[PDB]
Amino acid sequence: NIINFDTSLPTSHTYLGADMEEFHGRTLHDDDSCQVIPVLPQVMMILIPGQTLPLQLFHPQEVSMVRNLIQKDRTFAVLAYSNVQEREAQFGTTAEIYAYREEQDFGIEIVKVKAIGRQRFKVLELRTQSDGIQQAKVQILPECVLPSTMSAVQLESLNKCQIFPSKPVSREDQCSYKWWQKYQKRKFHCANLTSWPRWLYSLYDAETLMDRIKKQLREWDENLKDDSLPSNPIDFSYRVAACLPIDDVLRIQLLKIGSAIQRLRCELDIMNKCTSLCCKQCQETEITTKNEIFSLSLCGPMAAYVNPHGYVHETLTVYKACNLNLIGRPSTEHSWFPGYAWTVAQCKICASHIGWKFTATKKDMSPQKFWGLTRSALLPT
Amino acid sequence: MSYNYVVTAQKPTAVNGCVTGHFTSAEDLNLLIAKNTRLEIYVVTAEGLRPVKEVGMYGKIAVMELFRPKGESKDLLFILTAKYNACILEYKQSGESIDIITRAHGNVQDRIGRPSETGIIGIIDPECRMIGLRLYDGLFKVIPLDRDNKELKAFNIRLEELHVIDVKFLYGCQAPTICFVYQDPQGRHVKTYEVSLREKEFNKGPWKQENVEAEASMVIAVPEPFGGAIIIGQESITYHNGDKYLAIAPPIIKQSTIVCHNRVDPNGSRYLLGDMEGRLFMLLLEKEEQMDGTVTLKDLRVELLGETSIAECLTYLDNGVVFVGSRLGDSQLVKLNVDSNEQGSYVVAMETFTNLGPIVDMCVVDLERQGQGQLVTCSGAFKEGSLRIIRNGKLHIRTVPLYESPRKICYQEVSQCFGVLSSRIEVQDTSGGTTALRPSASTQALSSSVSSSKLFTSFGEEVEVHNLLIIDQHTFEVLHAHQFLQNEYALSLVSCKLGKDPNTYFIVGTAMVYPEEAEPKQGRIVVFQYSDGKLQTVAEKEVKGAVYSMVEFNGKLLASINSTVRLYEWTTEKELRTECNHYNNIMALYLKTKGDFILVGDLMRSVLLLAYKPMEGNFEEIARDFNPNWMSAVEILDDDNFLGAENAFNLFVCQKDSAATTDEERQHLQEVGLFHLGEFVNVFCHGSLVMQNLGETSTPTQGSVLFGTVNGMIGLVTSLSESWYNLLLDMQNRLNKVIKSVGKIEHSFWRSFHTERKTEPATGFIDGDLIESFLDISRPKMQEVVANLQYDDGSGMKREATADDLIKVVEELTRIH
Ligand SMILES: Nc1cccc2c1C(=O)N([C@H]1CCC(=O)NC1=O)C2=O
């Protein structure tokens, strides 16, 4: 099922605004060194690079910093806070501004800005400024890319038999199990010179790991092959890491890794060894059905969404969610999705403010089969 | 703070390129063999090959083609190094001190750009108008060649296609022409460009792009008067000339594809083709057509000649003698007699040059009466694997062929027999069985056995069947051949005694592999016990994972199942028992131990250290080191320093600083020494080739670690005293201003730490070859070598330092190998 809804509008966040002032992206950094960057407070979320984030700011100090940044380099630091609060952070990710809008209307501060992370860095000490926008020293962490594992011992003879033909058709049986055997037998042909077999080198390759991740993802949900999954291992790893339902400590551990292959192996291990989900205070929940989780968006099952009253909020698009209670009529005055009506779905035991059931609005839609969860009270077990 | 000393004992013998041309003189015919860091110039005669020179460059040879610019009497030589140290060498006989002067030198690498995935390609215009290269994707580098060009300035030219398979210049054209095949989603095509030097840009090719077979790999340029290029694929050998087009699909070359070639005639009427399986094809061109003075092809028949060593680079010498240069086997010199035909084979062996590599695993054994030591290696691969014995008393090397690839080795003494694993190729016949291909050493043993345990396709596909051989140390004949179950893969092998038991047990760790699943799920540890010429399975334990490497602890057995390091205790009931576990974040591949220190590595450089506290009985984690690189082999030099190899043929030494006053610094491993060895290291093992006499005061060297390499050279890395390192560093930094290397490549470059992302100067390592080369330098230059060395540190200085004292110093370091 595809429930006949375009999944590119929830990524653009139409509800936030319409007449956006687009900012063209050109920005990089020192490339393995250090810099200094303003930090926006009142935000607590680890931002994997490539993940979109919308922001809503009300106090004068941060909006003044926003205008100053707009008339400057477009970058601000979001420190990945640990479990302990009160500036107990060591790693942060920079954020880039690609769209801005005032929409002052009544007017207190009122800013309509969406941001995406670009790079990773570490903080030595958190310098404090009395203005309100603390600035920190920052060592731009490296992005280490590794060459092919077979390039060290490669023969000068069979150098030419290393560019394989493209995949046969796409996403078909007997065109992958048959083709991957030939791929492994031909690409890693010089594995006999070293003291290790071919499959061991296959465990530390880039293409095979990405194919396995893609197969697992399509086993989860109906993904249209190359539905905005970049062929580059870096961006693919970042996107898949962003779209997984994992705790914050494991996410910061993934952020710690600086190499694509190690990150992919660790992520594969994590989502292979993670099956169950919990309701924080509650002992257990029906959300354990990790297999039955589709993605009603182009960014994945998870994305960053904002509320009209403050802090950014997290979501999880699950097909069915039991152990929940529904309160309030279905309303869509401020909906995270254009053609959906949101209903505040509370819990059944702990009664936490987690869950949002979406009902039918049109004919070719999903009638009363949609939910949005919260990682604040959701933890893998 | 490492003070290590790396020296080369047996010079590398692998071959990665051979060309012929009138190099030494216009009348002689030379066979320049490019091995690796060394270059050898031979002279062909009626009897065979007569060596002339052994010249060693400061780099790895990657491109070597001979060209003859106008106005030259003898052919020059063009050599490109992996580190892009381009140079043009010219041979010159000066009396009897034959030296190779350097015509030009200069780096050609670009500041930014990923190296091509296919690899470096070197091509030269037949008219010697320019020199071509392909170093980075989409950048076909061109180096103009002129008498005034003594710096090798290169200008990039943009290639319209990124994935380029093979590019080689064409013959018989007024303007320079290239003919290359590229990869596109719509398929593979052959397209040509007319490179112009004046415009420094491409042009329109003589003949348009033509579709080719989906497995086009290698391109041969046919010389005059035919013209055009021959595109050889997995199934067909084609020919393109624009209007003309010939293609044939013989079934003989169907089994394996062709990877190497070399012309045999000035007009290219016949050709040579080699493949991985190891058979020498013989392509023929029919030139009987002659319409109006032009010559065109009529037939592309392919005729097989016979089976030789596994080809890496061929060459056709005079009088029908073909140098079948191998890389993973043994080099040969076959004769193409078309009149013998003993049974249908056109090739007969004449000579055999020893080729140690590719070494896979090693052991040091005193096979004589407790005298010297003897590096019993596991050379070869595919059908040419063999056991080599390397003594020190020039190194003498005797071969024991097995016709089967060996993986590891170990030497039990209380049964005076060797234990070597093996892996031979078995073809899947359409009957459910496993029929062999050739008589291998596993099927010709005195006895045999087949493992039978109950604890748990297509006709044409190949399946690997593993064996564990037992070889006597005297006759070197196979005595028994134990064979594991179907789809079982042998990884580890250790010969050690366990617990209080008096016997010596062969232990083999195996991990089942299935095509369906990616990583192994269940493995097996089997404990054999050789006695009275009969292998018996005393014990058998199953593990949910893969057994990657194993060692012994003074009566205990240690194994690394998947990502967990496990300790096994040998009980009195002869059944392995688990004692303690340590779940690691990495997958433990290498286990090297010394005392209570455990050096747990992986394939991604993540060196991790462990210490086994006996009072508590569980592992404790001491040191950490994380850095993304491909670590090849790791060895523990001493109680503190750990040695290993990593990407770009480098050597690194890590040191743990127990003197640090903070816990944050103690839990981290410094990088003290980095070195660019120039070889890929496969295995490390303790021991030395020289008699281990006490020697009263011994020598400045202390300790001994040997390493084997893919190219097959034996090195001896040791430790040094504090002042000796500074003295040797000063001597080495003064030697660079006396000796003149070939190509002018600077020593610090050929030894600088190299990586695709970062390069730093080498420290903590003394090059043993540069120091050992001092004894060959002429006496008058020795005065310039040393003038203020401050020779003694202990008890005097002798500022003058004379000249004879340094000779004694170098000889003491040379005596170790
Ligand atoms: N905590 C509050 C408080 C008031 C209103 C809303 C929320 C909230 O989370 N959303 C979501 C509901 C889900 C949706 O579709 N759009 C929203 O803004 C609201 O409208």
Ligand SMILES: [Zn+2]
């Ligand atoms: Zn609850």
